[PDB]
Structure 1
Amino acid sequence: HSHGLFKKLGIPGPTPLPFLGNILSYHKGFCMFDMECHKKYGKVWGFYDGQQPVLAITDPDMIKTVLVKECYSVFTNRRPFGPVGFMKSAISIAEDEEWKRLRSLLSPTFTSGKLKEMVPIIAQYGDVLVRNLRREAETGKPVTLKDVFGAYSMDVITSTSFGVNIDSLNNPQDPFVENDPFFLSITVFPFLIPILEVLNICVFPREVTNFLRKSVKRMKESHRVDFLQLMIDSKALSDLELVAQSIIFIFAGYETTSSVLSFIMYELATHPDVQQKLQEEIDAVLPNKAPPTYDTVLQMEYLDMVVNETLRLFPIAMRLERVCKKDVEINGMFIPKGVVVMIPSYALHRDPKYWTEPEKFLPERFSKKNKDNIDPYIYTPFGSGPRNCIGMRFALMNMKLALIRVLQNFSFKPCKETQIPLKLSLGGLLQPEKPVVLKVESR
């Protein structure tokens, strides 16, 4: 019974219940629980995910020590969840030297030279997204963004990860990836995890994967550029190791790209002045609906300010977590072994200590005048340090290339069904209660 740990260290926090800990406070959500704790407990507090002590830090120098300084020594891996199966070889689930080999083997896949080669492929579906948009604009009714953006993010994934060119929205019969009530029990009962592993049970639907893996056996052997072809050229890797990384690239590129693009278009439709100014910049850099290029995207500054400010209001990861590998003492406080150090990214992005009017959508926070006054460890939408988001530059380029072609042809206004203000899904995922619906008018 380690529930007396945070009071044995003099660290404030909510009082844990037996077995459950503080998981009953998650009825508001992880975001609201972190904002309420940071408000009443200060810079450092602790809580218990069942029997697992979780220490939350908000000090920028202390965050820098965890994410960047003592990364390879103390804070190398995140906390493990339940039955992972063969997915233990995922770069995000790998630990210690196992991860260092994968992070070094997959880093060249996200080079500035390799990414510029991917711009023409994902810009093709930017035209396909407009094709499905023009129809759902000429059909004359509000459009659910997560459908067209989910299809776009799916098409971008398949062509960049394997090259299987599909129109996910127009070919939904073959998607082929249409893929609390247990994870609440799994964290309070971590002793049941080895039982599910020996039963071949996994948190992911285990019957999947196998149909995505046998497709790599025919195309890897029996001039095209994609994530797969860049991994085969590369001690050396395994065939099953190649499958696990491609699965984590789809999960990290599907729900993330669509949700952020959904939050962005919600902020643009609710702020026509920002949408008006952004479309003027898009028309200025790209005259007469010019095709967006790699060098063109990296020039539009107001587009970068819009993407950065929406990621502040909605950091879809919510938290940054590291596992304390041994008894250490960082920046003046003692961290015992086994404690999960957590960085509340959502709570820090809405703190009046660093942001003026946190609930407001003000893209001018990230202009070249005020961008220098932003702490790189208070604003971490992609994490930081050696274990940051390895697909950060790919996601930014993928999302912006869609925002240009979408705004080059359409203006977005709210509808009667648009949930204003937007209510964050009290669930576990950082999304909105009711899906975003907007009016799409042709320019």
Structure 2
Amino acid sequence: SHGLFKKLGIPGPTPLPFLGNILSYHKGFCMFDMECHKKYGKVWGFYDGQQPVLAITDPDMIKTVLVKECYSVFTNRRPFFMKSAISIAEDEEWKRLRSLLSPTFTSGKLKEMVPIIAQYGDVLVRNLRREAETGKPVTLKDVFGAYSMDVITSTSFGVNIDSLNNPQDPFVENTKKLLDPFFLSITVFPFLIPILFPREVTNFLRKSVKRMKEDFLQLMIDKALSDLELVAQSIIFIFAGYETTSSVLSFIMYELATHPDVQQKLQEEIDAVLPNKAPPTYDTVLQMEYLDMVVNETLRLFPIAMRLERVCKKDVEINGMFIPKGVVVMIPSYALHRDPKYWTEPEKFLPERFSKKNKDNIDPYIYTPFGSGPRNCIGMRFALMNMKLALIRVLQNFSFKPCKETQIPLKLSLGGLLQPEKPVVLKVESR
């Protein structure tokens, strides 16, 4: 089906048989999208193996894909027991999951979780203090991974542990048992998908559900919600709240160290709203406008999901172009967030973009770090609050500086995760 886009008069790189365009992935998903946007412009088509993928960059078309024609045509992502997971689930079954999980992520239910995750903010500082007193730079991912792992367990299960100081709490190690060659192989060869996580891990969770069959799990329990449906959601939660939270935090702290003006200016906002290391609260966080700007700006530079995808369930025509059924429509968020067409000096870190003065000039469909429409990121409010509560406690206590080992400029990982090439390592000084 390599002839498809040329049959539609849609430009794009020339697919090779079988491989499609995946050989262009050597520069990384995101550079491909950026090279692609530069030369083909506003729409282009490429092949993930034999799978055609249509990339759109027009905000009207995007709104039509993510919001307008969502339930009708573009309801699902491509599929590539976890078929129950809300992100993989499809059509009426996704709808069902989403409707049952929508109240679990209310602004409401977040305010109740704030005293819980705040506490792990206090734990991050002590671990940070341990290293700062040593006098020497830190590998952010180990203390932000420890923080993010601690938070996500007790939020989804209510087990109070300390990843960084409790080596093998039996729940700790099994949580660490998470993990590409696969993806690339499957992108070109998804035709071995109907052939193939440790059965060991699902059990201890499906088991662990019992101790609650007696956290998200309760709010979820609050067609019947199959216990194993419940397990599929928690695993999606654990991966979401782990890998994303620690990565974004690394990216923020790198931007704060390389811009001491922003960091100290953020430290001032924290010191006025929360005088003398006052404990962060839910209403308080929502007051810190410059913190909101610092977070949104780091997510503009580093949208960890990179792309947003929808399958075209039927032959349709949106805003004047014909989308055949089975085409994957792709919104290249990364490339869009760095497009001189919509952003000034896109490579620069300028939190003032999102000022109450300039936030209104921003097209919500160009800026999609959490996606948009009914199928956008459900854990958005929680993710933002999880990260903001960590930054507050940290900048209430420390200031961060680059070191000889700080990789400046930060280079991105060549693979399919959005993470630093080299781990962010910064000097930590107690204020």
Tell me if both proteins adopt one fold, taking TM over 0.5 as the criterion: yes
Q: How far did residue 228 of structure 1 move?
A: 1.5
Indicate the percent of aligned positions where both proteins have the same amino acid: 100
For each residue in 1:17-70, what CA deviation from the matched residue of structure 2 results, as whole angstroms up to 9, or x when unmatched?
Answer: 010000000000000000000000000000000000000000000000000000
Q: How far did residue 306 of structure 1 move?
A: 0.1
Show structure 1 runs of 5+ residues with no match. 195-202
Match of 2:12, SS?
A: coil
- The match for 2:75 is 76
Query: Any conservation in 2 of the 1:324–1:340 contact (CA below 8 Å)?
Result: yes
Query: Any conservation in 2 of the 1:11–1:44 contact (CA below 8 Å)?
Result: yes
Q: Distance in 2 between matches of 1:182 and 1:250?
A: 21
For each residue in 1:392-420, what CA deviation from the matched residue of structure 2 results, as whole angstroms up to 9, or x when unmatched?
Answer: 00000110000000000000000000000
Task: Please point out which of 127, 137, 149 is paired with 1:132.
Answer: 127
Q: How far did residue 232 of structure 1 move?
A: 1.8
Q: Distance in 1 between matches of 2:193 and 2:408?
A: 41
Match of 1:284, SS?
A: helix
Q: How far did residue 205 of structure 1 move?
A: 3.4
Match of 1:14, SS?
A: coil
**Does the C-alpha gap of structure 1 residues 304 and 175 become closer, same or farther in structure 2, counting only changes over 3 Å?**
farther
Query: Any conservation in 2 of the 1:123–1:401 contact (CA below 8 Å)?
Result: yes
Q: Distance in 1 between matches of 2:41 and 2:233?
A: 39
Q: Distance in 1 between matches of 2:421 and 2:41?
A: 29
Q: Distance in 2 between matches of 1:425 and 1:333?
A: 35
Query: Any conservation in 2 of the 1:168–1:175 contact (CA below 8 Å)?
Result: no
Q: Distance in 1 between matches of 2:185 and 2:171?
A: 31
Indicate whether 1:153 and 2:152 are aligned.
no
**Does the C-alpha gap of structure 1 residues 238 and 28 become closer, same or farther in structure 2, counting only changes over 3 Å?**
same
Query: Any conservation in 1 of the 2:206–2:227 contact (CA below 8 Å)?
Result: no
**Does the C-alpha gap of structure 1 residues 145 and 175 become closer, same or farther in structure 2, counting only changes over 3 Å?**
farther
- The match for 2:29 is 30
Q: How far did residue 211 of structure 1 move?
A: 1.7
Q: Distance in 2 between matches of 1:332 and 1:51?
A: 25
Query: Any conservation in 1 of the 2:209–2:227 contact (CA below 8 Å)?
Result: no
For each residue in 1:261-297, what CA deviation from the matched residue of structure 2 results, as whole angstroms up to 9, or x when unmatched?
Answer: 0000000000000001000010000011111100000
Q: How far did residue 371 of structure 1 move?
A: 0.1
Q: How far did residue 177 of structure 1 move?
A: 4.9
For each residue in 1:155-198, what CA deviation from the matched residue of structure 2 results, as whole angstroms up to 9, or x when unmatched?
Answer: 1111110101100111122364557222222222222221xxxx
For each residue in 1:368-396, what CA deviation from the matched residue of structure 2 results, as whole angstroms up to 9, or x when unmatched?
Answer: 00000000000000000000000000000
Q: How far did residue 210 of structure 1 move?
A: 1.5
Please report the TM-score for the alignment, with normalisation by the length of structure 2.
0.97
Q: Distance in 2 between matches of 1:317 and 1:4?
A: 29
For each residue in 1:188-230, what CA deviation from the matched residue of structure 2 results, as whole angstroms up to 9, or x when unmatched?
Answer: 2222221xxxxxxxx7334322222211113320xxxx21121
CA RMSD across the alignment: 1.1
Structure ranking higher in helix proportion:
2
For each residue in 1:46-99, what CA deviation from the matched residue of structure 2 results, as whole angstroms up to 9, or x when unmatched?
Answer: 000000000000000000000000000000000012xxxx00000000001000
Query: Any conservation in 2 of the 1:424–1:431 contact (CA below 8 Å)?
Result: yes
Query: Any conservation in 2 of the 1:422–1:433 contact (CA below 8 Å)?
Result: yes
4+ runs deviating over 3 angstroms: 175-179
Query: Any conservation in 2 of the 1:328–1:335 contact (CA below 8 Å)?
Result: yes
Residue correspondences, number: 425
Q: How far did residue 421 of structure 1 move?
A: 0.1
Q: Distance in 1 between matches of 2:122 and 2:257?
A: 21
Query: Any conservation in 1 of the 2:412–2:420 contact (CA below 8 Å)?
Result: yes
Q: Distance in 2 between matches of 1:323 and 1:98?
A: 16
Query: Any conservation in 1 of the 2:28–2:415 contact (CA below 8 Å)?
Result: yes
